[PDB]
Design a protein around this ligand. Sequence first.
Ligand SMILES: NCCN[C@H]1CC[C@H](CC(=O)N[C@H]2Cc3cccc(C(=O)O)c3O[B-]2(O)O)CC1
Ligand SMILES: [Zn+2]
Ligand SMILES: [Zn+2]
Ligand SMILES: [Zn+2]
Length: 230
Amino acid sequence: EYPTVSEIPVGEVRLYQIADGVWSHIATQSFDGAVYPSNGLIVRDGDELLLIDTAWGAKNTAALLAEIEKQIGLPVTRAVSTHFHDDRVGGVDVLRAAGVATYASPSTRRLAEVEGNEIPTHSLEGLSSSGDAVRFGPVELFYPGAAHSTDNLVVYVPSASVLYGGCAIYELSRTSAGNVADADLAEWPTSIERIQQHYPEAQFVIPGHGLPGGLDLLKHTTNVVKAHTN
Ligand SMILES: NCCN[C@H]1CC[C@H](CC(=O)N[C@H]2Cc3cccc(C(=O)O)c3O[B-]2(O)O)CC1
Ligand SMILES: [Zn+2]
Ligand SMILES: [Zn+2]
Ligand SMILES: [Zn+2]
């Protein structure tokens, strides 16, 4: 049903429709010689589209654009990157050049600049304190606290009870810690519990990499992070 790493060639993107006017996008990328899948979101807002995350590099993000055009055929006008790493902002220049207004928090923009990663143009205000939520069209954006990265946002689509966790939330397949050099391991579980307290109504939970699940992915992630800590 949900597209899998093993069914997606590196360079192609697939869409999965989760509800009316809500899709995930799935791509794959090589990292240290393994192949990973990676998810983002697409959310309809009237006659245009809001994109959440790039598809992890220029080539994948151009493909995502063409796949959106062929399967949905609405224009992407805005995009939000959920943190500063390349699976979230790699492709921002491609988006900018297609006339998409690219957004991320000041924090994310700062960290991307330092890192040498592509920098979203626009700044999302009101997200600097743990627990902050802002409305961004047909979604709510939430800063739960440091976890996978200090700047990690999550995204909730109230219309469809879809919570998009990005890299702060692990799929059930991942049973040891992923890529954590920029992580706040000590605060990651407190951050997830903020997510649980703010979106206890979420039905469909999407991790940054892999298959979606329910609110159990939050508990799963907490288990994996505490086991890594120990
Ligand atoms: N100061 C640190 C040096 N800069 C470092 C900044 C991060 C980059 C690595 C990187 O690009 N990682 C992304 C791609 C990736 C790959 C595997 C698992 C995950 C996961 O989500 O678990 C994943 O997602 B990420 O967002 O983390 C290395 C240099
Ligand atoms: Zn990351
Ligand atoms: Zn603009
Ligand atoms: Zn990631």
